[PDB]
Every structure is written in C-alpha cells, then in structure tokens.
RNA sequence: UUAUAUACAACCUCAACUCAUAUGGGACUACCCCCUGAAUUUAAGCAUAUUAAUUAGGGGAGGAAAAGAAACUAACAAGGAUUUUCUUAGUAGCGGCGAGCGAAAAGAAAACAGUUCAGCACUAAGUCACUUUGUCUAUAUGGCAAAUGUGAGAUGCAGUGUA
RNA sequence: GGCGAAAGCGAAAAUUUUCAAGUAAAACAUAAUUU
RNA sequence: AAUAAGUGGGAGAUAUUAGACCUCGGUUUGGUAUCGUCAAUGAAAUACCACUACUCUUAUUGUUUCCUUACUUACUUGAUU
C-alpha cells in the first residue's frame, strides 16, 4: 500500500493508504513484477505516477521492505533466493503484527 | 487477414454493393417465418468479434420484431386519472429491440441460453436481428472451458436479467457521471438504496 | 484552343518549370507580360496594384529614367552611372518634343525628388494620365538607396480599369534554372502585396511579348 | 442491375481449360490422413532414433481456408488463387479478386464450390490459393497462367466499366418483342 | 464498393458548386462541426487524386 | 447432367422419424433481478410538479443476485475496479423558483483478485466431440490408447497474444 | 403463419415443407384424389 | 489609320529574302512592309501581344416540391383442391 498525496487544495498534506502501485516505478526499483505479485505487493498495473519524487517516495518504501522480507526457499537448496533462509521466521520473526504503518503523518 | 478487410467492407453499407446485396437478401429474408433455425451465420465475422467460435453447436436463430413504437393498452379513449398520462399514439418503449429479440428466443426455445446479438438489415416493417444461442449440455460444451463461463446456473436466461449486449446497455450501466444513478446496484435499485433510512442503534 | 510552348490547363509541380525557357521561339527581344485572373480584388478602392518586385537575377529590362536631382539624388549615384542632371528635364518633358525618333513620355517608370512633388500633378499630371506611366510615392522613390537598385531590375505596374495586366518584367531567352529562382521568388514577392491570400486564385498566367500566355500553378 | 463488381461472378473460363487446372491440383491435395498418420508415426519410431532433419521434404500443395489465404496473397508468396463463386455471403470472396490486380498476382475463379472441398476431405472449401513452383509441374504451369491473364487479370481493368446486367425476362420480353415485331410488320407499308 | 451516395452527391457539389453550403450540407448531414471537416477534405483527396489520373 | 427428355456424385438451403442420446415450462418470494407505471393525498381548490422512475406490477435467477477491471475522475505538491455504512448535505441545481424534491468525485472504515475473447505473424489443424474395442477402475452423461470407425472442423478449430 | 414488455388474445385463426385420412400399394415424389 | 474591347506594356515587332551556319526549314543580319511603338498629338498613343469574359453562341455528363408515359421483381389485391 504505497500511495501518497490526496487530490485537491483540501489536501496538500495527507496521503491515502495505497491502492495504486505504479508498474512503471517497478522496473526502476529492481522488480520483477510477477515475482513480486506472489510476494504480495498489490502490484496493480494501472497507475502511471507522474512525479519523480513520488516515483522516489515508494522507491525507498520499496527498499524499506524487500530486506526484512525473509525469502523462504522454494527448492530448499537455497542457492538462489537470495536474501536469507537462516532468518527463517521461527528463528527470526514469526511476528504476525497487524498495523502496517503508513509513516503516521 | 481477410476478416479485417471484411469488417472494413461491412461498414460501407450505403453503396450499390451492400445495399443491393441487402436488397436481394432482405426480401429473400421474409417468406421464411418468424422463427427458423439456420446452419450458418450470415455475417460470419460479426458473428465473430462477439465472443464466438464455431464448435458443435453454436446455433443461429433468425428473428424479427415489428419495428415501431408502443401503444398503451387501454381501450379506445385513453387513460383515466391525469393529463400527465393521456398521451398514447407516440409513446416509446425502453428496452431496445436488440434485447427484445432475445426474449423472443428464450421462452419459445425452452432449452438454450443467449450469448450476444447482431443486426443485419432494416426495412420499415421489421428490424430483424440474429441470436447466437449457446447449447447448454451438449457433452462437448462442459469440456470447452474458454466458454465455460456461461453455463454456471447464474448466467442462464440472460435476456430477462439484462446482461446481453443491449440488455446491459438498456438499464443505464457504466461509470461515472453520466450514469450516477444508476449506481446503486442495478438501475432503480438506486431508488430503493438512497431512500433507506438508518435509524441507528445509538443516535 | 491552347498552345504547346504555353501550357494553360495542365498544372505541373516543381519539376515542370524546366521547359519554360523554350518560349524564346523568336530571335528578337520579347518582354514577359505578367497577368493574373483576379477575384474580388477591386481596383477603385485603396487596393492599388502598384509596387516593385526585386528579381535577384537581371533579366535586363530596358530601363531609362530621367533622374530629377536636387542635392540628394546624384550625390552617391556615381556607382551606378547616373545621368547627373539637376532636375531640369521636367521643363521640356511636356508641351514639346525633344528630338527626332523620340516621344515626350519616353520611359517605363519615373522617379521624383522629395521636394518636387506638388509639380507632379499640375504641369506633368494632365499629360501623363493620358500615358498611364504616372510615378507614385510607394514605388521605391527615395533615391538614398534607390540608385544601385535602378539597374537592378526595377519595375512599376499600374492597375487598369478594365481588369487586365500587361507590364514588362523580363525575358525568356535565358536558362530556366534562372527561371527556377525567378518565378518562385517573384510570385512569393506577389503574395506580400496582395491581400487576404490563403486560397483565392487557382493559377498564374505568364505571357511574353510575342508569345501565347503560359499558365503555372 | 447488380453492381459491376458483379459480374466479376460468374464469367468463368470455359471448362476445356479448367479441367486441366484441376490436373495440377490432383498432385497437390494437402494430406491423406493415414498418409498424414504414417508420416507422423515415422517420427515416433524411426526419427525419434534417427536424429535426421533432411528427408521430410514438406510438399508444396494448395492452401485452404480464407484466413490462411489473405496472408499468402499479401506476403507475395502465392502464385495462383482459385476462389469459388457459388458462395456465401460474398464478403469472404467479394473484395478478394480486386486485390489481385493491385497485388499483381494472377488469379482465377472456378465453377462449383464443392469440388474444391471434394478432394481436401472437408465439406465445402471456397478458398484454394496455390504456391507450388516445382519443376515437375512447371511445364504446364506457364500456359494456363497465360490463359487466366486476359480472362481474369487483364479483364480486371475493364470489368467494372461495362456491366448493366439483369435482363428483364422472359414472357414479358416476348410481349416487349411483340410490339416491335408488330410495328415492323406495319413499318413495311408506311414508307412503301 | 463505390461511394455512399451523399459523398457522391456532394462530389458533384465540390466541383465548383458552392463549397460553403456544400460543407454545411455535410454538417447538416453527418453532422457535427468537428466531424464534418474530416469528411469534407476526404472528398477533395479523392478529387486531388483524380485531376489528371482520371483520363483513361 | 436442367425440349422442365435419364443416371451418379457432391454441395446448398430443408425435411420426417414410438430412431439413438439428452436439455427445458413449472412451484415459491421477504431479499433480489429486466419489466410495464397508475391514485386518493400535498398546492389550503387544481391541471406540470407530488403519491413515484411508487401496491397488483410476473418473464427471470441464486446463495448470492445485478455491478466490476473505467471511452471515470478531478485540474490539484494528484488520484485510480465494483458494491454497503458515516460524512460530503438536507448544502449544488431541478423547481405554478409553489408545496416540495435532490445527488455527487473528493476525505476516512471493512474487504481485497486479478484476467480471457475479436482482430497483424501465432506460423505443417499441430483441433474438438461421438462411436466401437480393451487398459484403469467408479454408483464418473468417467481417465489410456486404438480401429486413425464417424462427423464436426477452413464459411475456421488450437496454442502463444488484449482497452 | 401472426402480433403483445410478458400473461395471454370482449378473434368466419380459411396464409401455415409433406401442414393429405390415406389407399393390400406399381416402377421412377402408389393414382386422379383430401384443406 | 480609322473604329486602339478597353487600357497598359512597348520605344519596334512580325513576315519576306538572300547571306552566315545546319542534312534542311527557319532564326538572325539588312532591305521592304498594312498599320503603328515614334510622329500624325488626343479619351485611351493603336504596331507587336493579351488575361478575361459577356450580347451570347454551337456542344457536353445538370442535381431539378420537375411534369407526363411505360416497365415489374420489391410490394399491395383476389382467385382457384
């Protein structure tokens, strides 16, 4: 849920919680579309985000994730996943915490 | 491909070619009745463009409707009550003929669903369309799963419930602000949605 | 009833100007006479068809002009071989003749001094509207730079009250590669003097002094 | 009066040369199905172990299907096009001979829409455009393509220009011819 | 296919026959003053291809 | 093969069958769906307004129905499928500018899921369904081949490709 | 056959491939026949 | 020179001829020329050469609430087994 900046002069402040995700951002941020879809991104193929820093705004928010994303292996030879498999959630996280913060304004 | 040519020649109606190929075709098309099965769709390529293949068996049924207005059934000197409600001899129906011409298949034919439609021709005493029926339980059609969508139970008889080509378009459906009611579900299920008062648990 | 050396109906593109040099079927000089089939260009108003085009090649118009000079016409005019007179030929240009084999209206275009203007309709005026070679004030008449351009092919056309046109611009005896830059610049110098032009005429007409009129697009 | 894109049907090249046209087509049936089966089952047992790429020699025959053909016309690989004329509706075949003058390729029309589908093991076929340029049928190739030139392709520049068509017919024409036969029996004595 | 007869009836009209009303004969016909101006000049594209290729 | 003088083979429209083999009108209705559209009442009377795009309205569905992946917004430091609720708001306009009607993107909340058709070039019908005979079993209108037995299929089947 | 949004039609449904009952029958729609 | 459509270009064209050259006409040179650019002098400077177009004129494929007449296959109206 990445999206920022609500429309008119009522809001130059707030930022609605993320229904867009900008396909043309993604190739500039190391993805990898349908691999990210079964990760779970809400990848949606229809938003054409117009601003370079709004392009950048999710770019850091992308790289905010994808690192703490723990990479569970598929073939369990785990040669190419490739962040970690020793950070398995029983060892590392297993958190299942709700809130998913949107930077809190 | 020939089809992109033959659509490009289908449009150019008001010719001597198509009109005087309509002219032979039109009053060929009348000593036959209101219903008769055919093998082959007269337009093939606009029986194509419509979600259509030609396996066994996607039947085609000719149909005519009576090309007019609609007069309001009260006898001989018209309605009581109010002068908002007098005028008859010009009153006009709502559902277009291209969604009446699939009710007049779906009940005379007790066996089959309805898929799309396409016009052919028009002259003054009928407009007269085609119906691309679909069989429902030919034991081929269960294992043909690109057109599997229509033989769930909730899609049968899609002439009444208004989800053919024209019967979709008849009830005022799209988005946004040329359509803003109808939005509350169907059409005038708007005009039971918005008058629905919410006397709360805790006001 | 059209001719071969002068085409009328058939409209060529850009490569159809190469054979127009063949209009010199004579051996003597023929002055090309322009004309235009004009539409809604009425001459009795301020739309006066009177100006000068500047053809960058010299098609040698036979130019003789009496240079009326009062300390401003002939001071810098020794670079173009002026006659160097003191504006005294006006006293003999009308009411009498000069010499044998000569008329009293013997030019094509005339120049006047800036301080010698009120005489031009009075003593010479009634004897020149009978000729129609009347010099105007908008026909490149200042004689500060109008000396080197005098041998550099200056013309003056007066509009007729019968809707015709025949004035000398040049000849057709030379190469059509000269005429590739002659017509395509003179008619581009004709768009600026004519008015409200986007598409108001359908073709041009070009005619020599001894030939039939050719027509260009 | 049918408009003079018709009659592009059915002035159709008298059958003494047309039977020679089918004699090329006797070699160019697409595939017999057991011969199709015996070719592909040899892939299964022999060429699955043979590892050979040469001996297929995919034989050039005449292609079928309208949606095949109008690629093959436009990609300039086709040689001779045969389209039927007993046809429906026209729009699969109406514009198609008009392509051939603008695309330069010689074409022809045939009588009998079933005879193109008699040999190809379908039911009715309507579109057979030929690509084959082999030396075994190169001899009889040149003479029949010269015949369809003036009849179909060089005729194609003046076929729309001359057609009124649709004669009146026929008993009424007898009454039409009755008066002129009557008045010519009277015209023998007016000026006499 | 030939012509659709309003184009042909105006094909006579765009010869010399009063282009302005002929143009408004299309906007009366088709007709919206954005759509007609394309269908106006389409006729002249036929007419500018058949001024000297129209011989034989 | 048609002076309307015969066969055979297709085709094309097109029948008839105590053929084979199978699908459908009906019941209910609260909710839902496309339909047809009235009236007392209110204006202190009434005729356009209102009752109302409303009760019979009946033809259709289901555990969902319709909608739904924009020919939308908004005009901004942008947003972004459909549906219901809070608010937008009893405000904008429609109004015998009478009585009275009446929305809306935008703001926040649940849930979230995106994609096949048609049509260039996609480039050996490589397709699909019956049949019979067995494989394999199962209360299957069933899974594997085959005779390649039909027929459907080029008037186009399939794969890849889609606002 | 027809029309109606459907239910159904204050209806001499006389138009509706054969819309023939058929007839112990004959090739080669059994023969003139039955609205 | 009248009678220059008119009005302006023009300040001589054109034709002829032999000579020059070419296979040759012809162009050019000069002689001559009905007039004329010139003069004859006025309203247009008439030679030379015109775009335009009507008084209109011969002819062409004209849409025409065009009129009238036949045609028939669309369609309407019956008849018969």
Numbering used by the authors:
A (entry chain CL): 55 to 159
B (entry chain CN): 2 to 204
C (entry chain Cz): 1 to 217
D (entry chain CG): 80 to 271
E (entry chain Ci): 58 to 113
Extract from the study:
Protein synthesis is essential across the tree of life and undertaken by the highly conserved macromolecular complex of ‘the ribosome’. mRNA translation is regulated at many levels, but until recently the ribosome itself was not thought to be part of this control system. Here, we have characterised ribosomal protein heterogeneity across 4 tissues of Drosophila melanogaster. We have solved the cryo-EM structures of three different ribosome complexes purified from complex in vivo tissues; 80S ribosomes from the testis (3.5 Å), 80S ribosomes from the ovary (3.0 Å) and polysomal ribosomes from the testis (4.9 Å), improving the resolution from the only other previous ribosome from D. melanogaster.
The presence of IFRD1 does not affect the paralog enrichment events because the testis specific paralog enrichment was identical between the testis 80S and testis polysome ribosomes, and polysomes are unlikely to be translational repressed. It is clear from the density map that IFRD1 is not present in either the P- or E-sites; rather there is density for the E-tRNA in these actively translating ribosomes.
